[PDB]
Amino acid sequence: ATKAVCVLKGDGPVQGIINFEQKESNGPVKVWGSIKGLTEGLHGFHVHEFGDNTAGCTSAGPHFNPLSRKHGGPKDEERHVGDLGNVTADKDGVADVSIEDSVISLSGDHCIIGRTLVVHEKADDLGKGGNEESTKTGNAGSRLACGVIGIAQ
Amino acid sequence: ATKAVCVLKGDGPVQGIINFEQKESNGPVKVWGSIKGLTEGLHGFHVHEFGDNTAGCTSAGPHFNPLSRKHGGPKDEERHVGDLGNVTADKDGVADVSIEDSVISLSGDHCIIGRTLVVHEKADDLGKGGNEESTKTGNAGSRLACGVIGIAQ
Ligand SMILES: O=C(Nc1ccccc1)c1ccccc1[SeH]
Ligand SMILES: O=C(Nc1ccccc1)c1ccccc1[SeH]
Numbered sequence: 001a002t003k004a005v006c007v008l009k010g011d012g013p014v015q016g017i018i019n020f021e022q023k024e025s026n027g028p029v030k031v032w033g034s035i036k037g038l039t040e041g042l043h044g045f046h047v048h049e050f051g052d053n054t055a056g057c058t059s060a061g062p063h064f065n066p067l068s069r070k071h072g073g074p075k076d077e078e079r080h081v082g083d084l085g086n087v088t089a090d091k092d093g094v095a096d097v098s099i100e101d102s103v104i105s106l107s108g109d110h111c112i113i114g115r116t117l118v119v120h121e122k123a124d125d126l127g128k129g130g131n132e133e134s135t136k137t138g139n140a141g142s143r144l145a146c147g148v149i150g151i152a153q
Numbered sequence: 154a155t156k157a158v159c160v161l162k163g164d165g166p167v168q169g170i171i172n173f174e175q176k177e178s179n180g181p182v183k184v185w186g187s188i189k190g191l192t193e194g195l196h197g198f199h200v201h202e203f204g205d206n207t208a209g210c211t212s213a214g215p216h217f218n219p220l221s222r223k224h225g226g227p228k229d230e231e232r233h234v235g236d237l238g239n240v241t242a243d244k245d246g247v248a249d250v251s252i253e254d255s256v257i258s259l260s261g262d263h264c265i266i267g268r269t270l271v272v273h274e275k276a277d278d279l280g281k282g283g284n285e286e287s288t289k290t291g292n293a294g295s296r297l298a299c300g301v302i303g304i305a306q
């Protein structure tokens with residue numbers, strides 16, 4: 001098994017801990033944890049290309065897209081590798097994250113270790129927003145919190 | 154060329170930005186940047202095994218040591234991959250970092266991306282301190298600041 005972890009930090013405080021576990025290189029990645037300090041509703045959840053947080057979340061670059069595809073939701077064939085959809089925050093502002101994803105990996109050229117996990121202001125429209133931006137970013141607004149994805153024990 | 158970057162933060166005044174560049178596969182890695190908020194003198198400079206900053210620097214684990222060697226300095230044969238020696242802070246508390254290292258890498262088994270860069274309270278004795286701890290950690294004291302090493306553009 002390979003394991004990774006990410007601390008999400010940004011103003012609010014929006015703060016979170018996200019764990020990644022992959023039992024074999026050819027297998028899905030289980031993504032679990034918690035994010036607090038969010039507004040109730042959906043928040044875009046992306047792996048951005050660079051693990052560069054030198055100017056905060058703005059330095060992380062575009063959606064991680066090694067295969068040169070368009071933006072989508074995690075269940076879509078047409079998606080970026082970094083398209084993990086939305087997390088859902090309750091009325092206490094807590095998003096309990098539980099995702100399994102077959103496209104991200106913790107090895108090979110879909111590897112997300114060393115890249116930036118980002119939680120967004122607004123919902124990711126999953127490429128179904130009806131404008132040009134929808135199929136590039138999903139219109140999820142500002143980057144509320146982020147962190148670099150690291151190797152875990 | 155491959156590039157990586159790391160933002161060093163902690164609980165106190167120490168903060169920094171460190172850049173990594175490796176022009177050729179299996180070539181030396183250039184390390185440069187700046188750290189401020191330090192006491193004047195030598196400060197241990199390590200890649201630790203885990204990119205896990207969930208409890209700050211304390212979760213980063215031992216020295217990155219994929220080859221099962223003892224602790225040393227960067228110019229020693231007997232060293233951990235993560236043994237980058239010391240950085241030097243001036244009387245303004247600023248350390249200008251400029252290192253070339255041929256043991257760390259930005260790809261493969263020696264890869265430091267997704268691991269934690271740590272700057273220490275005290276000098277790393279480079280395995281020459283005269284106690285057992287010297288050849289395990291180098292006696293560099295507390296972890297003042299750290300961050301996860303991320304992929305850069
Ligand atoms: O292993 C990685 N990439 C990779 C890319 C292409 C072929 C084989 C391997 C990787 C690189 C940097 C950080 C994290 C990982 Se997982
Ligand atoms: O690139 C990496 N490994 C790797 C391993 C075997 C073949 C090719 C590449 C890597 C994995 C995890 C974190 C960081 C790096 Se740089």
Ligand SMILES: [Zn+2]
Binds near residue numbers: 046048118120
């Ligand atoms: Zn995003």
Ligand SMILES: [Zn+2]
Binds near residue numbers: 079080083137
């Ligand atoms: Zn996308």
Ligand SMILES: [Zn+2]
Binds near residue numbers: 197201273
């Ligand atoms: Zn250390």
Ligand SMILES: [Zn+2]
Binds near residue numbers: 216224225232233236
């Ligand atoms: Zn060491």
